[PDB]
Amino acid sequence: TSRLTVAGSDAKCDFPATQDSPPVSGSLTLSKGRMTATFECSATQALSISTIPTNIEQNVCDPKKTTNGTVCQFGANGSAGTEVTLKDLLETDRIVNWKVNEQSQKWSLELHNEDLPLTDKAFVVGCQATSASGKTAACKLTVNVEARASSLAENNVVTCAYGKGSNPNPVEVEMSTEKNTLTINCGSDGSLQPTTYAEEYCVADSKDVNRCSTTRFVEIFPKFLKSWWVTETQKRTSATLTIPQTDLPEADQQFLVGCVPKKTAAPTSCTVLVTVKAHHHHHH
Numbered sequence: 001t002s003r004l005t006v007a008g009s010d011a012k013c014d015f016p017a018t019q020d021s022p023p024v025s026g027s028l029t030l031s032k033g034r035m036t037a038t039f040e041c042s043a044t045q046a047l048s049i050s051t052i053p054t055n056i057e058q059n060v061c062d063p064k065k066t067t068n069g070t071v072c073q074f075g076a077n078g079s080a081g082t083e084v085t086l087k088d089l090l091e092t093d094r095i096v097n098w099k100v101n102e103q104s105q106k107w108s109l110e111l112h113n114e115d116l117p118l119t120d121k122a123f124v125v126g127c128q129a130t131s132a133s134g135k136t137a138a139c140k141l142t143v144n145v146e147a148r149a150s151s152l153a154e155n156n157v158v159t160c161a162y163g164k165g166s167n168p169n170p171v172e173v174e175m176s177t178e179k180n181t182l183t184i185n186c187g188s189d190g191s192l193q194p195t196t197y198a199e200e201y202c203v204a205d206s207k208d209v210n211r212c213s214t215t216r217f218v219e220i221f222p223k224f225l226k227s228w229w230v231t232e233t234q235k236r237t238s239a240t241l242t243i244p245q246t247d248l249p250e251a252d253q254q255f256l257v258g259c260v261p262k263k264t265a266a267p268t269s270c271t272v273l274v275t276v277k278a279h280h281h282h283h284h
């Protein structure tokens with residue numbers, strides 16, 4: 001016998017059955033503002049509980065990774081893909097793991113903003129209780145992790161993401177004398193748009209990088225040179241435009257670039273709508 005309870009981002013599995021049974025299954029979602037999941041597994045005195053994967057403090061299951069490394073087993077028959085680390089599933093830099101609560105086992109997973117992926121992710125963890133050749137029951141928990149939002153940071157650095165909820169609107173960016181640079185980071189999941197960004201932009205009227213009509217940058221910046229763009233050379237997924245401060249246009253112009261999911265979780269594109277303000281002192 002198995003029982004799963006879920007309220008917000010806290011899940012509890014509780015384990016004398018009529019017959020045997022598939023894993024009791026449920027889900028929860030982590031995102032900005034709901035960054036901590038908890039998982040508890042408890043059983044009556046005669047049952048031993050294990051987790052799936054066997055070490056939850058090191059690994060989670062990727063149901064998408066089936067051809068593999070080590071398989072995530074539920075019961076004698078069941079499978080939920082393969083063991084991955086969270087940092088690998090999330091494609092992020094910081095080591096992130098479920099943590100045992102020290103003080104009926106319970107675990108906590110706390111994401112930080114920097115842990116939020118560029119694309120929508122899901123993983124699976126579970127508990128299995130074995131009777132004293134013994135009978136099992138299990139709970140299966142799917143945790144969906146929503147992609148970070150595409151965003152603008154100081155010094156006009158754009159972080160693009162591609163999740164279902166990542167791109168409600170274009171990211172609006174101002175350039176002017178005091179703010180004469182633009183950096184676009186597509187990450188390894190994305191590609192700079194237009195592909196010809198070193199010479200061209202997308203006409204801004206579409207407000208959507210997915211509807212990109214290319215036009216030459218010289219048409220709006222008469223002094224434009226290709227050298228105004230520098231691309232990260234090992235990383236061709238980031239580039240920075242620097243308009244020399246005396247070379248800003250004499251009238252306001254607007255252009256669009258961005259990041260599209262790479263020509264191959266990632267349903268949306270990142271549109272960056274740039275307004276170039278002539279005769280503008282942002283801080284004064």
Ligand SMILES: [Zn+2]
Nearest residue numbers: 094112113114
């Ligand atoms: Zn942190």
Ligand SMILES: [Zn+2]
Nearest residue numbers: 112113114115
């Ligand atoms: Zn921090």
Ligand SMILES: [Zn+2]
Nearest residue numbers: 091119188189
């Ligand atoms: Zn990826």
Ligand SMILES: [Zn+2]
Nearest residue numbers: 196199200214
């Ligand atoms: Zn062209």
Ligand SMILES: [Zn+2]
Nearest residue numbers: 249250278279
């Ligand atoms: Zn002027």
Ligand SMILES: [Zn+2]
Nearest residue numbers: 178281282284
């Ligand atoms: Zn100024």
Ligand SMILES: [Zn+2]
Nearest residue numbers: 174280281282
């Ligand atoms: Zn301004």
Ligand SMILES: [Zn+2]
Nearest residue numbers: 154155282283
């Ligand atoms: Zn400022």
